[PDB]
Amino acid sequence: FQGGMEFLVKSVRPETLKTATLVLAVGEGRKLGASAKAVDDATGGAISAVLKRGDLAGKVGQTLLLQSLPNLKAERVLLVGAGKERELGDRQYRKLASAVLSTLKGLAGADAALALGDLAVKGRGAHAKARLLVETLADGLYVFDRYKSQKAEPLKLKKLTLLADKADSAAVEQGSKEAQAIANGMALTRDLGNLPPNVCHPTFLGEQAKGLAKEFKSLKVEVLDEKKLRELGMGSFLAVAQGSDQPPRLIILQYNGAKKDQAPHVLVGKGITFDTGGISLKPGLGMDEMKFDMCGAASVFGTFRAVLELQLPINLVGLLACAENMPSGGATRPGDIVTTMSGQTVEILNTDAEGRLVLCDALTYAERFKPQSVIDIATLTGACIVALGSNTSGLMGNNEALVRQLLKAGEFADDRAWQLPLFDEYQEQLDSPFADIANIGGPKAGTITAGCFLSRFAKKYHWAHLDIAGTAWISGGKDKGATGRPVPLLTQYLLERAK
Amino acid sequence: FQGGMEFLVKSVRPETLKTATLVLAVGEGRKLGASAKAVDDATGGAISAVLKRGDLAGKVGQTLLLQSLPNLKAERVLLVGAGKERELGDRQYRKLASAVLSTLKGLAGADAALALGDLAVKGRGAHAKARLLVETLADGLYVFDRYKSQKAEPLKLKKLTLLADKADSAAVEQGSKEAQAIANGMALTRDLGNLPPNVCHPTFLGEQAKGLAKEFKSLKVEVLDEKKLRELGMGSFLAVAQGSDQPPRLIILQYNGAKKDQAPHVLVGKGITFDTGGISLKPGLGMDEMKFDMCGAASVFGTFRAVLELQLPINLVGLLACAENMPSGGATRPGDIVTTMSGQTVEILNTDAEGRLVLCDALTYAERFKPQSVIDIATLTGACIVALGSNTSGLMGNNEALVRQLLKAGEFADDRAWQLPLFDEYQEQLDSPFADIANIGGPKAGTITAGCFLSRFAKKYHWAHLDIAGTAWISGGKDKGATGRPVPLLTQYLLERAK
Amino acid sequence: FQGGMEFLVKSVRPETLKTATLVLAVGEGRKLGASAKAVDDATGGAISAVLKRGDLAGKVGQTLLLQSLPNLKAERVLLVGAGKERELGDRQYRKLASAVLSTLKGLAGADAALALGDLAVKGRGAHAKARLLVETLADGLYVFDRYKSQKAEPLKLKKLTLLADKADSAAVEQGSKEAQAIANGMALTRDLGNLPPNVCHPTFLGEQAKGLAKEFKSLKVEVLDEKKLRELGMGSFLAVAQGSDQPPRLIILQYNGAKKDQAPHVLVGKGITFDTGGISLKPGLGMDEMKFDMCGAASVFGTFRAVLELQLPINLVGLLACAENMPSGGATRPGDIVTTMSGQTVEILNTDAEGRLVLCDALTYAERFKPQSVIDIATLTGACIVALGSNTSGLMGNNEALVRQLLKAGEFADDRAWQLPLFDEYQEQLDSPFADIANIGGPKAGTITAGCFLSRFAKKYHWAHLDIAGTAWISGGKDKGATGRPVPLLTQYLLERAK
Ligand SMILES: CC(C)C[C@H](NC(=O)[C@@H](O)[C@H](N)Cc1ccccc1)C(=O)O
Ligand SMILES: CC(C)C[C@H](NC(=O)[C@@H](O)[C@H](N)Cc1ccccc1)C(=O)O
Ligand SMILES: CC(C)C[C@H](NC(=O)[C@@H](O)[C@H](N)Cc1ccccc1)C(=O)O
Ligand SMILES: [Mn+2]
Ligand SMILES: [Mn+2]
Ligand SMILES: [Mn+2]
Ligand SMILES: [Mn+2]
Ligand SMILES: [Mn+2]
Ligand SMILES: [Mn+2]
């Protein structure tokens, strides 16, 4: 998705700014903040006169669109309700921004100017509000129509101006710049997740990574095929892949924005391009949504895309463990025992617990980078949706400082996670009479035991695990599709590590 | 269960103490701590001579039983392995204690003396180790054989002596005293949970509370019947009860150990004496375990029993909301709408979400006590077992300080909980087109939305919610039955509030 | 729901009419019909000037709201898109009307004037368009908030004026009058369906019928209790009811608008106020929607309400067979054999096929009225949703002319049905080795065999059967609730019979 929206920050007077649409906030009770009052005064009270008619109650997201008003250079004035509180929460601020965007998308105006600086958002200053506002606007422009014969009508809206006080403009510009890069990374993530699995297979993802290296000269890419995986001894990764006609790929992304002495941060992504379950076959209902089972790997693409645009001074490694999980006459069977890269043997009791089998070999591979943090991202357990639903990612890890850094990043990004414990008592659920580890722990604590399985391959470094099974996509309705989460959390984490 | 084990703390020399069995720890490699070395020296090296034969590797919990040794007044010497580490974890310490207890139960000795003061446990001093050791021993003596025609053979073991240094003896005695009271409360809790539902119905629990008031003059009890519930307007509590022939009971326990000016702590317990699911009937498999669905209420009994024995200087209120959930020609139907005590209307979409319907009316009732904390305890969601398994209780609440106090208490007691978030975004899952609240939130985030439902009745005070669906009992095997959790967490919380 | 919207038909010029909001249609390409052109000319081209800006593409249902325009007496002008075709279909016309209504509901205007006479709708003249438009508007005003503590904000909109040419005004007024009565009947139907089953039980429906007789002196009501049903020998009706604490009711409505020599039309409605399935218990998931299992009976209420308002010259009888289907220690069992009123014995193989057991006794009862048509209406089979979905009712009968009359009525009302065959070959699926009829026919042709069962009680008159299991309510989402169908079909059928 080409994006291309221009976001500008300006400190000019709203009431003399030439624009197709000037956007103003209105509180409940027809109450007017400083910017809206100044525009109203410029029109001679035309805005307060309309509001007195009572059509706009001022609840968050309600709108009233006015045409040409006296003495303004704005062709239209859009009023958006901001509720009755002095301070909006994050959800309300996003809802207001989305309501503005939805109106602007349907207009023929080529630009709009947002005079929303008077809004207050709990716990967020100028930079933090700009981060949320611009990310919501930019990501709200995302369109996936690759396989529609009838394409979307192109938007007339090509430019958005954020009006800010001179004292705040530098922070608003910084927030906008960071949010745009995050949303650009989100768009790549969403594209890859949304692509169907007959197109987006492991080989395709390897070519996508080579494409990203053509676009960004600071990125180096290596794509390893099944011969190299066998050379490296990644027996559990290969066990997942062997049932499919599609070969697996381990994609290595490397970006060196800091000095050679700075240890890298490693992102490990689950790239299961389609998960049938294998011989442990899934039910048919909703199985199409397993095209999103590579969204962990896609979020590594997207985080790299944001970091490469921002040119952050950090050293970053991405490992995308990509395979397709299929039934066949040569597929892995329940009860197979394999030897992982690490040398630990694994009894594969259920071939639908396959993401942890490609991830564990990638976690062993990650040791060579002498990393200062390793984060894996995976659409890993249905149990995580039972535990935390569709709006909060599960988070687990072996280092409290890293876990806290990721939680803090998710809070700032409003792309939240929540820690679940890896108490040693859970580990015995993975005991196998036949191997070093079983790949399932039974019906109890499923998100945790999956994290426990992964932890056995991450003991040599500081590691965390994001289970995005609930947050990586929307299952149904008009908005079915990949979300791009957790690119905002991950990019925020890296922004903080880059300071 | 009458208990009756005598726990004594003494500071005498182990090698001259008259006892049926002297218990000593042995490390891996036949290594001997200070107490064991002193006993060995007293026997002229008889213990190190035996250990040299190699039968006891010294792994945690392994045992070797010796008879009469030279120059000792101990009739027997029990060696128990303590592993290879300088410091045991909590799990290892419990395992060692249980191994000792299992051996002693099978001997004809009338007492045993534990010379285990040399063991180190990570993060635990004398008092904290005594708390864990004595609770494990005392609770390990629990027996439920009420309906067995062949009763357990009575134990010969009637006395346990803990040997401690003079400088540690006061802390060991304090820990022992507190642990015994906790285990006594646990025994009452376990008895009530284990009793079958044709015996332990709401009326029976009301009589149990009157029995507890006869035993403890500091306790006052009121038992409210269905006429009083209707007078109070508890429409959702009554909706759960109406399908059953057994009438409901709201049991009120009050203990005033502090001055009248000290606001009380309120414990609210789910007392569903059997949960068939109602019209939303449960499957038959394992449904017998729903006799444990009153374990939340039973843990309020048990916590009171511990507090009453210890005479803690706190003001404590217990509210046990007791009903039986049955199908019948007059039972509540899916789609019924009722008015709670609070005035909020609830659409009962699923009659198997019944615990929250008796709890919410009890939470409204709790307002009259002007409490400084309100904790409800409930075997509330199967989703909590998916999220946190059988060993960690789910914890939710509306006050961060209270939540942290409960987590800290569970850590100290080794009866741990884990917080799940009540983010406002989850609340919309309870939206009903027909009432103020629906009683279910769907397949996503089931433990959280149950907590969200309860939170709507707890806004007037500091409140937390413990979902013990996984921790309140053991489902199968030789040890099937109620655990008594979370009496240790709750009593520890109150001990800390009483300082 | 009190309704109360005033619908007026006027033939005045739109451009001089005083109104809070004047509504005009705009075609794709900014094309203007006669009324819209006349208003535009009155403003000096202000409307075409705005449209030239391009914000309103003119797709069906899109809107653009203007404030005060030059030389108009309308405070606001609402433009609504009408698409690119010369003629709208029924669905498009409804969508346009709903879009207008949704906008008007959010404005503070006390009235609105619709200048939509220039719209063409395929196959519909002035009267038929008014029927669809006014029914959509009036039914779109329905609100059910009985058990919400926070009530809906009252609408400012209290009056809608339909502008029509003088030559069309009589037909528009007639269509409006009929549509308002249909929507008023729909509102009663929807209220009863939406009421929860602990409130809306058979006794309650009997009192509702007495209430309707207080409002309409032309209506006579008799309510028969279980003693009378037993006297009449309705063994299958009583078999359904016996498991519940709620007694059954047979409600008889009689309206004599024609001469005594005119044979009556009889409407028979399934009034199962809640369907648990009985001993053949339903699964828990979605079972709350069985509060809509009395929507057949509710549609008889609603059709009577429309006929009574219109004072149609017909003789009409309503039979509401009302019971609650519950499990209990006295409930009917699978394998029970009962004797129906007709004397035919029925083997009740499945207690969840209960609607046909109350209907068949009511169909025998209907014989006494010497009817010229008998129509039963029932939320009868899940198979009907498999066959015809949620938008088309299933229709079956023993008389081709009656079936065709009902199909024609559903087409005119845009509340369509579709015939399924009652070929004699299907009848053998109801053979029982033990009784005259089994109450189920197995997994094949479930909607048809239910109709076949009913047909065995309707041989003495011209009879049809509407299976509204899919059309009587909306299952989920924001708009969950009763629809009021098939009141429009039934009232249209009676309007045609009254000519
Ligand atoms: C076999 C089980 C122990 C593990 C299993 N996990 C998987 O199948 C993963 O590979 C799935 N990719 C997890 C998943 C399933 C449905 C929706 C979102 C995410 C699961 O059922 O969660
Ligand atoms: C209907 C659902 C929203 C809620 C439902 N909860 C219940 O049935 C509770 O009343 C049960 N007492 C919860 C439970 C079930 C099995 C094992 C332990 C605990 C559940 O399935 O968890
Ligand atoms: C037992 C079967 C032969 C008949 C059975 N019918 C019923 O249960 C009716 O009483 C139901 N009221 C039919 C129904 C079910 C679900 C949604 C809408 C309507 C059915 O399953 O359709
Ligand atoms: Mn899988
Ligand atoms: Mn998977
Ligand atoms: Mn239940
Ligand atoms: Mn329960
Ligand atoms: Mn049924
Ligand atoms: Mn039914």
Pairing of strands A63-66, A74-81: antiparallel
Resolution of the coordinates, Å: 1.7
Residues A93-118 as b/e (b if ≥16 CB within 10 A, e otherwise) read bbbbbebbbebbebbbbebbbbbbbb
The whole-angstrom separation of Cα A348 and Cα A335 is 5
Strand B159-163's sheet: what is its strand order? B6-10, B159-163, B111-115, B19-26, B74-81, B63-66
- What is the torsion angle, in degrees rounded to the nearest 10, for the CA atoms of residue C138, residue C141, residue C145 and residue C149? -150
**Residues near A245 by Cβ (< 8 Å), separated by ≥ 6?**
A326, A328
- A270 CA from centroid of ligand 5 (Å): 8
The reply to whether ligand 3 has any atom less than 6 angstroms from the CB of C335 is: no
Is residue A381 within 6 Å of ligand 1 at its C-beta? Answer: yes
Which of B282, B408, B456, B460 is an active site residue?
B282
Asked if A80 and A102 count as a contact pair (C-beta separation under 8 A), the reply is: no
Contacting residues for A207 by C-beta, under 8 A, at least 6 apart: none
Chain A hits for B424, Cβ within 8 Å: 89, 91
Give the separation between CA A480 and CA A458, rounded to whole angstroms: 34
| Amino acid in position C71 | N
Angle at the Cα of C335 from the Cα atoms of C329 and C336, rounded to 5 degrees: 65
Q: Do C53 and A108 touch (CB under 8 A)?
A: yes
CA distance B129 to B93: 9
Pick from A326, A381, A374: which is nearest to A353 by CA? A381
Catalytic, B91? Answer no
On whether any CB of chain B is under 8 Å from the CB of A485, the answer is: no
The answer to whether residue A356 is catalytic is: yes
Query: What are the CB-based long-range contacts (under 8 Å, 24+) for B124-130?
Result: B124/B90, B125/B171, B126/B164, B126/B168, B126/B171, B126/B172, B126/B175, B127/B171, B127/B172, B127/B174, B127/B175, B128/B175, B128/B412, B129/B93, B129/B172, B129/B175, B130/B162, B130/B171, B130/B172, B130/B173, B130/B174, B130/B175, B130/B176, B130/B179
Nearest-CA distance from B386 to chain A in Å?
5
Phi/psi-derived region of residue A286, left when phi > 0, alpha when psi is between -120 and 50, beta in every other case: left
Chain C adjacent subunits, 3+ CB pairs under 8 A: A, B
* Distance in angstroms (rounded) separating the CA atoms of residues C273 and B163: 72
Among B280, B328, B436, the residue with its CB nearest the CB of C148 is B436
For residue B486, say if its preceding peptide bond is cis, omega within 30 degrees of 0.
yes
Two structure tokens written together for C186: 């729909």
For residues A304 and A298, give the distance between their C-alpha atoms in angstroms, rounded to a whole number. Answer: 10
Structure token pair of residue A466: 């994001």
Distance B49 CA to ligand 2 centre (A): 57
Q: Which two tokens stand for residue B171?
A: 């802390």
**Token pair in block for residue C56:** 């309103």
Residue C476, min C-alpha distance to chain B (Å): 9
How many Å from the N-terminal Cα to the C-terminal Cα in chain A?
30
Nearest residue to C353 via CA among C373, C367, C332: C332
Considering only CB atoms, A55 lies closest to which of C53, C62, C108, namely C108
Contacts B436 to C, Cβ<8 Å:
147-150
Sole residue written with tokens 């705009």: C26
Nearest-angstrom CA–CA distance, C84 and A455:
61
Neighbours of B326 (CB within 10 A): 22
Place of tokens 């001469």: C259
Helix (H, G, I), strand (E, B) or coil at A87: coil
Q: Is C440 in the pocket of ligand 3 (CB under 6 A)?
A: yes
DSSP helix, strand, coil percent of chain A (3-state; round to 5): 40, 20, 40
For residue C106, which residues of chain A lie inside 8 Å, CB to CB? 55, 62
Is any ligand 3 atom within 6 A of the Cβ of residue C376? no
Contact between residue A176 and residue A134 where contact means Cβ atoms under 8 Å apart: yes
- Decide: B153 and B202 in contact? Cβ < 8 Å: no
Name all chains with 3 or more CB-CB pairs below 8 Å to chain B. Answer: A, C
Does A293 sit in the ligand 1 pocket, CB within 6 Å?
yes
Which sign, positive or negative, has the C-alpha torsion B69, B74, B76, B80? negative
DSSP character at residue B30:
T
Q: SS3 sequence, B62-123? A: CEEEECCCCCCCEEEEEEEECCCCCCECHHHHHHHHHHHHHHHHCCCCCEEEEECCCCCECC
What Cα–Cα distance (Å) separates residue B335 from each residue in B29, B279, B328, B432? Answer: 67, 11, 16, 11
Distance CA C26, CA C380 (A): 44
CB C434 within 8 A of CB C336: no
Residue C98: count of CB within 10 angstroms of its CB: 15
Phi-psi region of C494 (alpha: psi -120 to 50; beta: other; left: phi over 0): alpha
Q: Is B352's C-beta closer than 6 angstroms to any atom of ligand 2?
A: yes
Q: C128: which 2 tokens?
A: 């038929």
Give the residues across from A279 on adjacent strands: none
Residue B31 annotated as part of some ligand binding site: no
Residue type, A278: G
How many Cβ atoms sit within 10 Å of the Cβ of residue C190? 28
Q: Is the CB of B355 under 6 A from ligand 2?
A: yes
Question: Around Cβ A150, how many Cβ atoms within 10 Å?
Answer: 6
d(Cα A58, Cα A35) in Å, to the nearest integer? 16
A27, A60 contact by CB (below 8 A)? no
Pairing of strands A373-378, A463-467: parallel
CA atoms within 13 A on the CB side of B194: 22
Strand, coil or helix: A419: strand
| Phi and psi angles of residue C26, each rounded to the nearest 5 degrees, phi first | -130, 130
- Contacting residues of A for B429, CB less than 8 Å apart: 389
Most B-contacting residue of C150, C198, C282 (CB-CB within 10 A), to test interface: C198
Q: Which of B91, B447, B470 sits opposite A425 (nearest CB)?
A: B91
CA distance C382 to chain B (A): 18
- In single-letter form, the type of residue at position B69 comes to L
Amino acid (1-letter code) at residue C480 = K
CA distances from C458 to C354, C362, C367, C462, C490 (A): 18, 10, 8, 8, 19
- β-pairing verdict for C315-325 and C265-275: parallel
Q: Which residues contact B488 (CB under 8 A, 6 or more apart)?
A: B135, B182, B186, B410, B413, B414, B415
Closest CB to B426: pick one of A89, A389, A426: A389
Please give the backbone phi and psi of residue A317, each rounded to the nearest 5 degrees, phi first: -125, 135
Residues with CB under 5 A from ligand 4 (ion): A 275, 352, 354
User: Cβ atoms within 10 A of the Cβ of A330, count?
Assistant: 9
Q: Using CA atoms, how far apart are residues A341 and A233, in angstroms rounded to an integer?
A: 5
Contact B386 A89 (CB under 8 A): no
Of the residues A352, A357, A437, which should be mutated to test ligand 1's pocket, given the most ligand atoms within 8 Å of the CB? A352
For residue B467 and ligand 2, the question of a CB distance below 6 A is answered with no
**At which residue do the structure tokens 């047909």 appear?**
C455
Other CB atoms closer than 10 Å to residue B12's CB: what's the count?
12
- Identity of residue B250: L
- Residues A356, A416, A485, A497: which is the catalytic one? A356
| Residue B440 Cβ < 6 Å to ligand 2 | yes
Which tokens in the block code for residue A303?
């985080």
Antiparallel, parallel or unpaired: β A336-339 and A417-419: unpaired
Q: List the C345-348 sheet strands across, edge first.
A: C336-339, C345-348, C437-438
Question: How is A103-161 classified by DSSP, letter by letter?
Answer: HHHTS--SEEEEE-TT--BTTB-HHHHHHHHHHHHHHHT----TT-SSPPPPPS--EEE
Q: For residue C21, what is the nearest residue in chain A, using CA coordinates?
A: A55
Q: Which-ligand-closest: CA of C446?
A: 3
The closest of B246, B180, B235 to B435, measured between CA atoms, is B235
Q: Which residues of A touch B446 (CB under 8 A)?
A: 386
Contact assignment for C198 to B336 by CB distance below 8 Å: yes
Q: How many residues does chain C have?
A: 499
CA of C294: how far to CAs of B366, C195, C204, C242, in Å?
40, 10, 12, 17
Question: How many residue pairs from chains B and C have C-beta atoms closer than 8 A?
Answer: 93
Which of B294, B326, B352 best tests ligand 2's pocket when mutated (most atoms within 8 Å of CB)? B352
Give chain A's largest Cα–Cα span: 83
Contacts of C210 (CB under 8 A, 6+ apart): C221, C223
B182 C-beta closer than 6 A to ligand 2? no
Q: After which residues is chain B broken (C to N over 2.5 A)?
A: none
User: Which stretches of C46-186 are assigned E, i.e. beta strand?
Assistant: 63-66, 74-81, 111-115, 159-163
A255 phi and psi angles, rounded to 5 deg: -135, 125
Residues in chain B: 499
* CA-angle at A422, arms to A416 and A426, nearest 5°: 135
The amino acid sitting at C271 is: G
Distance from CA of C221 to the nearest CA of B (A): 28
| Alpha-carbon torsion (A167, A173, A178, A180), positive or negative | positive
Residue C191 labelled as part of a binding site: no
Nearest residue on chain A to C65, alpha-carbon basis:
A65
DSSP string, A26-55: EBTTTB--HHHHHHHHHTTSHHHHHHHT--
Q: What number of other Cβ atoms are within 10 A of residue C28's Cβ?
A: 16
User: By the CB < 8 Å criterion, does B456 face chain C?
Assistant: no
- Comparing C-alpha atoms, which of B43, B101, B37 is closest to residue B68? B43
Closest atom of ligand 1 relative to the A446 alpha carbon: 3
C-beta separation of B448 from B394 below 8 A: no
Minimal CA–CA distance to C166: which of C131, C126, C130, C136?
C126
Q: Peptide bond preceding B70: is omega within 30 degrees of 0, i.e. cis?
A: no
State the binding site of A for Mn(2+): 270, 275, 293, 352, 354
Which residue in C has a C-alpha nearest to residue B334's C-alpha? C288
Residues in chain A, overall count: 499
Closest by CA to B461, choosing from B343, B376, B354, B338, is: B376
In what helix (H) or strand (E) does residue C482 lie, and over which residues does it extend? strand C481-482
Contact between residue C325 and residue C197 where contact means Cβ atoms under 8 Å apart: no
Strands C417-419 and B74-81: unpaired
Experimental method: X-ray
> Which residues of B are less than 8 Å from A388 in CB distance?
387, 420-421, 445, 448
**Buried (b) or exposed (e) across A219-249, using 16+ Cβ within 10 A?**
bebebbebeebeebebbbbbbbbbbbebbbb
* Contact criterion met (CB below 8 Å) for A17 and A73: yes
Q: Which residue has the tokens 């309100």?
A: B374
Q: Does B418 touch chain A (CB under 8 A)?
A: yes
